[PDB]
Design a protein around this ligand. Structure first.
Ligand SMILES: [Zn+2]
Length: 118
């Protein structure tokens, strides 16, 4: 059930048919190199209590993750960039830490899925 929950399987299956696995795996390699810096910027903005900085970085990750089918990371970045939500002030530091702790795992789950599908 982890593949279904963390990845966008319909999008990935259509992508495999249209482009093949190489564009997905190359995109994923770029995502892995940029994510350490994206999460560090989220954290430094959280410390500075810079709301615009946090929302801007959330939006960048949302797009980045959605491009490679990381549906749950995309949903976290959607929540991070949504200060209109009643729970935002209470939970944005929790969603930041959740992202920090899990993104490498979510990348390993997509790598395995692409390996099995191909
Ligand atoms: Zn999570």
């Amino acid at each position: 059930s982890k593949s279904e929950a963390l990845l966008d399987i319909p999008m990935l299956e259509q992508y495999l048919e249209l482009v093949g696995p190489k564009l997905i795996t190359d995109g994923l390699a770029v995502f892995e190199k940029m994510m350490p810096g994206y999460v560090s910027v989220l954290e430094s903005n959280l410390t500075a209590q810079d709301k615009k900085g946090i929302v801007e970085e959330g939006h960048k990750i949302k797009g980045a993750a959605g491009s490679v089918g990381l549906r749950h990371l995309q949903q976290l970045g959607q929540q991070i960039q949504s200060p209109d939500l009643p729970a935002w002030e209470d939970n944005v530091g929790e969603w930041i830490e959740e992202m920090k702790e899990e993104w490498r795992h979510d990348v390993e789950v997509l790598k395995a899925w692409v390996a099995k599908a191909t």
